[PDB]
């Protein structure tokens, strides 16, 4: 049985610009058990029907995980635009897998703001699918070199979520797991 709890029940989650990935292989994935295990607010799939998942075999599955605003879970999908999909975590158009999310306000908010969760705001170009950009190089928006410092046309490229427990629901923190269903090679992850 696939060790999904190692991803879903992780104590701390990555920031979306620094999204984490766990390869899952050589195990039986039971998604009806996963679905009924928790109070997921998003459980959607692509290239596969959510309700026919326990008869599927794949070579590997990758579990990527990070924290974003509830109003940004809609960007975690193929064909989406927006700062999250463009600069932080990008799915290919032909993505096969599921996107799962839940409200984490009770874990990830802090009175006076939790500023640990970050996202990228500036980038010279959009991410390719599954690209991961951790750079903190000052973004040069104009023709003048920035010399590693902020200033005119020179921007620190990351921004903090200010997760407070009183935030509106669109602005509360959501933990997200993206399960990527890869099939190249003998299959090592099957439903029951």
């Amino acid at each position, epitope marked *: 049985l696939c060790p999904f709890g190692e991803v879903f029940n992780a104590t701390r989650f990555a920031s979306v610009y620094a999204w984490n990935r766990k390869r899952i292989s050589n195990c039986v994935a039971d998604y009806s058990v996963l679905y009924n295990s928790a109070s997921f607010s998003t459980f959607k799939c692509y290239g596969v029907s959510p309700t026919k998942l326990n008869d599927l075999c794949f070579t590997n599955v990758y579990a990527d995980s990070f924290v974003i605003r509830g109003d940004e879970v809609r960007q975690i999908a193929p064909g989406q635009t927006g*700062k999250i999909a463009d600069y932080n975590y990008k799915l290919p158009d032909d993505f096969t897998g599921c996107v799962i999310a839940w409200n984490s306000n009770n874990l990830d908010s802090k009175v006076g703001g939790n500023y640990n969760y*970050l996202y990228r705001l*500036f980038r010279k170009s959009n991410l390719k699918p599954f690209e991961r950009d951790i750079s903190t190089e000052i973004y040069q928006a104009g023709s003048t070199p920035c010399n590693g410092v902020e200033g*005119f*046309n020179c921007y*620190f490229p990351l*921004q903090s979520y200010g997760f407070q427990p009183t935030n509106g629901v669109g602005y509360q923190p959501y933990r997200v797991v993206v399960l990527s269903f890869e099939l190249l090679a003998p299959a090592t992850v099957c439903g029951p």
Partner: antibody, heavy 125, light 110 residues
Framework: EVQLVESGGGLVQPGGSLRLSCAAS????????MTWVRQAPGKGLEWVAN????????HYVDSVRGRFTISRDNAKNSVYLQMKGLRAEDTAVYYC??????????????????WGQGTLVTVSS | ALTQPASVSGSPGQSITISCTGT?????????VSWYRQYPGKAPQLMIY???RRPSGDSDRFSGSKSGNTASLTISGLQAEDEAEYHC???????????FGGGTKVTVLG
């Protein structure tokens, strides 16, 4: 080059409504804070409103609270100032500007940098 | 909100200095003083930011400094085309998130 093309404005009576807009090109609009500034005739500049790159935050000078709404449409690279209950003291040239903003992570503020050409708002009975 | 002279004059070639006095919660509280030049009927143009930094070579004759709650802008090698209004400003970290002085008219004596 950066362009901020201002639209809207004109003449209304007290209690009337206006909407200003600023259309941006030459920079990645949804990465930047936007700011509105006004200038009554023969007077200096006055800060009016600002809005975060993601609308998650917007601020207003006290005398326009509950009468002006700042907003933005990132898909259209535009920022807007919706004005209701206009008073004569609101008569001014209004400028949209880029930045005006504040990064919590670095505690760095970028000054209003590129400015629209201005548009005249006249409130008169 | 900030205090600057209504007007200053200098002769061509000279340096002039425009002061801009605020309080501990703005000019004295940040290094976020900015100066704008504005010609009649035109939008402001950022000439100095972070008290003393230049966005471009257009500010090569401009310099800034700050002591206590007063900032200063100096224009050197004064030219006829420097006749304009100059606005100081500062971040406040509260409404108004940006404060301005009333503007200074620079006259180049002719």
């Amino acid at each position: 080059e950066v362009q901020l093309v201002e639209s809207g404005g004109g003449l209304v009576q007290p209690g009337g409504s206006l909407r200003l807009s600023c259309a941006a090109s030459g920079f990645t609009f949804y990465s930047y804070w936007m700011t509105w500034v006004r200038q009554a005739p023969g007077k200096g500049l006055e800060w009016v409103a600002n809005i975060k790159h993601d609308e998650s935050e917007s601020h207003y000078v006290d005398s326009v609270r509950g009468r002006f709404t700042i907003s933005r449409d990132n898909a259209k690279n535009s920022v807007y100032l919706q004005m209701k209950g206009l008073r004569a003291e609101d008569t001014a040239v209004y400028y949209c500007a880029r930045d005006g903003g504040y990064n919590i992570l670095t505690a760095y503020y970028h000054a209003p940098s590129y400015w629209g050409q201005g548009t005249l708002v006249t409130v008169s009975s | 909100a900030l205090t600057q002279p209504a007007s200053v004059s200098g002769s061509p070639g000279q340096s002039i200095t425009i002061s801009c006095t605020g309080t501990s919660s703005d000019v004295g509280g940040y290094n976020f003083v900015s100066w704008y030049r504005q010609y009649p009927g035109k939008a402001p143009q950022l000439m100095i930011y972070d008290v003393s930094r230049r966005p471009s070579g257009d500010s090569d004759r401009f310099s800034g400094s700050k002591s206590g709650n007063t900032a200063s802008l100096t224009i050197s090698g004064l030219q006829a085309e420097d006749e304009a209004e100059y606005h100081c400003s500062s971040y406040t970290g509260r409404s108004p998130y940006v404060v301005f002085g009333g503007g200074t008219k620079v006259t180049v004596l002719g």
